[PDB]
From a paper:
The [name] system contains three protein members and modulates intracellular c-di-GMP levels in response to signals received in the periplasm. YfiN is repressed by specific interaction between its periplasmic PAS domain and the periplasmic protein [name]. [name] is an OmpA/Pal-like outer-membrane lipoprotein that can activate YfiN by sequestering [name] in an unknown manner.
As expected, both mutants form a stable complex with [name]. Finally, we crystalized [name] in complex with the YfiBL43P mutant and solved the structure at 1.78 Å resolution by molecular replacement using [name] and [name] as models. The [name]-[name] complex is a 2:2 heterotetramer in which the [name] dimer is clamped by two separated YfiBL43P molecules with a total buried surface area of 3161.2 Å2. The majority of the α1 helix (residues 34–43) is invisible on the electron density map, and the α2 helix and β1 and β2 strands are rearranged to form a long loop containing two short α-helix turns, thus embracing the [name] dimer. The [name]-[name] interface can be divided into two regions. Region I is formed by numerous main-chain and side-chain hydrophilic interactions between residues E45, G47 and E53 from the N-terminal extended loop of [name] and residues S57, R60, A89 and H177 from [name] (Fig. 3D-I(i)). In region II, the side chains of R96, E98 and E157 from [name] interact with the side chains of E163, S146 and R171 from [name], respectively. Similarly, in the [name]-bound YfiBL43P structure, the sulfate ion interacts with the side-chain atoms of D102 (corresponding to D71 in Pal) and R117 (corresponding to R86 in Pal) and the main-chain amide of N68 (corresponding to D37 in Pal).
Residue numbers in the entry:
A (entry chain B): 44 to 167
B (entry chain A): 40 to 186
Write the structure that this text describes.
């Protein structure tokens, strides 16, 4: 029910800094992002979540097919971190959505940067 | 039953709200119900949170450009893809908790996407949508979808 009101200041790991973003045309993570992911992975396991869907995305530069593949590679890189964090391999679904579902405006450098992402979805 | 489900939706919403913090907490929490819904009739009667705060609810139009400043929470009904994009363009950059009645469009847009009609209400959560929302959501909220 409404036990969230008992929460104090610890464990708020889903803030603005928890986005999982990639550099232009990159499908690999850097130390800032991998550290971010491990903290997310640990937070999820701490609340007994052992199953996620990972959906990769690109900005809208280039052709659709290339971006579809790029988005899949991004989701794979995130899955690896989840496996190493202790999540069971069989419980991690990977999906690529390519350029089809932007969250930001592709007409700006900043917007394209926000679109280069993997969204972590916690299924029912 | 639809009534039974509506009440369950009211309760899971109150549950979720308790795990959320707004950067500027209002005296009265404002909820807007947007688009066609089956299970919002309970919400729309008004609610009270366990912290003592009233939740005021009303229906607003999908094409209202000021949704982001007119509510703290949006409960989003069954809207097509153009409308859905319109809504989240309006919400972008505002500190708004978003919950969708149906659980199939959670790749982008809503933070929580409900599944109503099973033996118990469950939901999916999109952590990227949560990260962008402008509100704080504690990970232990995820336990409400389980058991």
């Amino acid at each position: 029910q409404e036990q969230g009101f008992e929460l104090r200041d610890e464990g708020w790991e889903f803030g603005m800094s928890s986005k999982v973003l990639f550099g232009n045309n990159l499908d690999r993570l850097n130390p800032d992002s991998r550290n971010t992911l491990t903290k997310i992975a640990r937070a999820l396991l701490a609340v007994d979540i052992d199953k996620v869907r990972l959906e990769g995305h690109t900005d809208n530069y280039g052709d659709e097919g290339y971006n579809q593949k790029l988005s899949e590679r991004r989701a794979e890189s995130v899955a690896a971190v989840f496996r190493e964090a202790g999540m069971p391999a069989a419980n991690i679904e990977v999906r690529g959505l390519g350029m089809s579902k932007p969250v930001a405006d592709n007409k700006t450098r900043a917007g394209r940067s926000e679109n280069r992402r993997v969204a972590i979805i916690v299924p029912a | 039953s639809i009534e039974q489900r509506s009440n369950a939706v009211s309760q899971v919403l109150l549950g979720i709200f308790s795990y959320v913090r707004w950067p500027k907490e209002p005296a009265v929490l404002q909820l807007c119900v947007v688009g066609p819904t089956e299970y919002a009739d309970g919400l729309l009667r008004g609610m009270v949170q366990a912290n003592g705060r009233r939740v005021h609810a009303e229906r607003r139009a999908v094409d209202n450009p000021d949704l982001g400043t007119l509510c703290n929470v949006i409960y989003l009904g069954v809207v097509d893809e153009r409308e859905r994009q319109q809504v989240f363009r309006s919400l972008a950059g505002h500190p708004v908790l978003s919950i969708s009645e149906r659980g199939t469009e959670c790749s982008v847009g809503s933070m929580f996407c409900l599944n109503v009609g099973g033996p118990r209400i469950t939901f999916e959560a999109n952590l990227d949508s949560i990260a962008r929302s402008g509100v704080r959501v504690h990970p232990s909220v995820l336990k409400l979808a389980r058991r």
